[PDB]
């Protein structure tokens, strides 16, 4: 299972000029292209060494596609002001996520196309890729207007064809970075708590991709209700980090083991203090 994904963002700023229009592209949840209307010489840029192997007609196209979408979003935001009878001097947000997940063979698994206004669901393309789920009366105006235009047919044409065919190519030309696995280096630290007990901290560092499970065991029992977790955080070099902690008494430290399970590990990792 792989995915191609585009996260688009338009933010207004009545009194600072035209809205800041943003696009970020992902393959398997990893960023590889990016667009920002505010950037000096604003244009579609590479965000990974493997996409840099694309010809110039590739970049001119997306820089022009992006800029064309920017022109529409500026209007949408104006359309979503009268839909809600909102003051013209308020800064508002319109987010858009489209993409296509592809099953192990290569044919389309799921196709995405939803919008969000000021952080809430606005409208979305259903799994049938035929019908729209709108969230409120204002989004129902959009829903009917797209049904008469035939939008989903044009929208599905992308998800089932070009979106799939270019994901199948991105995977073929950028495998060495995307499909690489970096095994997490693991280790445990020791911290005396003030209340007399001890906190053990078991770090999982510098690993790709992001999905990991971290657990502490006592005699085989997993200790989920006494574990303190941190969400996975990016090291900033493309790899990630994560630790888990438990509060164990003195002397009994070597009773507890930490079991690291990543996809870059054939067996899990076991560690004590």
């Amino acid at each position: 299972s792989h995915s191609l994904r585009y996260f688009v963002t338009a933010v207004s700023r009545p009194g600072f000029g035209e809205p800041r229009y943003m696009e970020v592209g992902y393959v398997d949840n990893t960023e590889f292209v990016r667009f920002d209307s505010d950037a000096e010489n604003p244009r579609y840029e590479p965000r990974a060494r493997w996409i840099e192997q694309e010809g110039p007609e590739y970049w001119e196209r997306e820089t022009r596609r992006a800029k064309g979408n920017e022109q529409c979003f500026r209007v949408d935001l104006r359309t979503a002001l009268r839909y809600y009878n909102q003051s013209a001097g308020g800064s508002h947000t319109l987010q858009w996520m489209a993409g296509c997940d592809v099953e192990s063979d290569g044919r389309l698994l799921r196709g995405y196309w939803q919008f969000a206004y000021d952080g809430c669901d606005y409208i979305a393309l259903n799994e049938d890729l035929k019908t729209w789920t709108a969230a409120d009366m204002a989004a129902q105006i959009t829903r009917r207007k797209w049904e008469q235009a035939g939008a989903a047919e044009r929208d599905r044409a992308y998800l089932e064809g070009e979106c799939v065919e270019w994901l199948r190519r991105y995977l073929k030309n950028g495998n060495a970075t995307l499909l690489r696995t970096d095994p997490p280096k693991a280790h445990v630290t020791h911290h005396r708590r003030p209340e007399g007990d001890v906190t053990l901290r078991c770090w999982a560092l510098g690993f790709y991709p992001a999905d990991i499970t971290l657990t502490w065991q006592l005699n085989g029992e997993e200790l989920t209700q006494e574990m303190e977790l941190v969400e996975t955080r990016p090291a900033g070099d493309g790899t990630f980090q994560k630790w888990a902690s438990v509060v164990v008494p003195l002397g009994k430290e070597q009773k507890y083991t930490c079991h690291v399970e990543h996809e870059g590990l054939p067996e899990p990792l076991t560690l004590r203090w």
């Binding site: 596609r65 992006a66 529409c72 979003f73 489209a98 929208d155 070009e162 979106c163």
Partner: peptide, 6 residues
Amino acid sequence: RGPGCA
């Protein structure tokens, strides 16, 4: 590539 506007 990315999607477009109508």
